Each structure stands twice: as C-alpha cells, then as structure tokens.
UniProtKB/Swiss-Prot annotation, chain B:
It comes from Rattus norvegicus (Rat). MVP 3 mediates interaction with PTEN. This is Major vault protein. The lineage of its organism: Eukaryota, Metazoa, Chordata, Craniata, Vertebrata. Required for normal vault structure. Vaults are multi-subunit structures that may act as scaffolds for proteins involved in signal transduction. Vaults may also play a role in nucleo-cytoplasmic transport. Down-regulates IFNG-mediated STAT1 signaling and subsequent activation of JAK. Down-regulates SRC activity and signaling through MAP kinases. It is found in: Cytoplasm; Nucleus. The chain holds residues 711 to 760 of 861 of the full protein. The vault ribonucleoprotein particle is a huge (400 A x 670 A) cage structure of 12.9 MDa. It consists of a dimer of half-vaults, with each half-vault comprising 39 identical major vault protein (MVP) chains, PARP4 and one or more vault RNAs (vRNAs). Interacts with TEP1. Interacts with PTEN and activated MAPK1. The phosphorylated protein interacts with the SH2 domains of PTPN11 and SRC. Interacts with APEX1. May interact with ZNF540. Phosphorylated on Tyr residues after EGF stimulation. Dephosphorylated by PTPN11.
Length: 51, 50
C-alpha cells in the first residue's frame, strides 16, 4: 500500500523537479539576457563611470 | 487437602482456559480481519493511486 504511494509520489516529484528547474532556468535566461541588453545599452566605460 | 487441591486447580484452570480459548478465537479472528483489511487497504490505496 505505502510503496505504491511512495513510488507514485516519487515519479511525480521527479517531474515536479523538472517544473521547478525549468522555472529557474527560463526565468534566469530572461534575467541574464535583460542584463545583457541593459549593460550593452550603456557601454563598458559608461557603466563603470556610473557605478 | 487433596479435595481442596483438585477443587482449587479446577476452578483456576477453568477461568484460565476459558480466557485462553477466547484469546485463541480472538487471535484467529484478528488475523482473518487483518487479511480482509489488508485486501481493503491494498485496493483502496491502489484505486486512489490512480
């Protein structure tokens, strides 16, 4: 009884992990690409002077 | 003394063996209910698993 529940919750957790990592993945690619465009918009010396 | 010994041992063995027989019947009943409840749980949780 318990082993089937544990096994079923196990595969669900594995796929729920894929949900979590994909959420972290894509939300960071956009976070990094936006930072890519943000710092490219200003300029290498310009951002240094601003900071 | 012999009469008291046999009477007391009979009176004690009666109240002890009735308890033992009742406990044996309860043990057999309990293991059979354990099988039936095991089937019930193993099918309830299996369907609820789906």
């Amino acid at each position: 009884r318990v082993k089937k529940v544990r096994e079923m919750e196990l595969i669900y957790a594995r796929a729920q992990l894929e949900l979590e990592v994909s959420k972290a993945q894509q939300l960071a690619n956009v976070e990094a690409k936006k930072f890519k465009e943000m710092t490219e918009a200003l300029g290498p010396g310009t951002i240094r002077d601003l900071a | 003394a012999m009469s008291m010994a046999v009477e007391s041992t009979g009176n004690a063995k009666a109240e002890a063996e009735s308890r033992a027989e009742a406990a044996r019947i309860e043990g057999e009943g309990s293991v059979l209910q354990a099988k039936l409840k095991a089937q019930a749980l193993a099918i309830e949780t299996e369907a609820e698993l789906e």
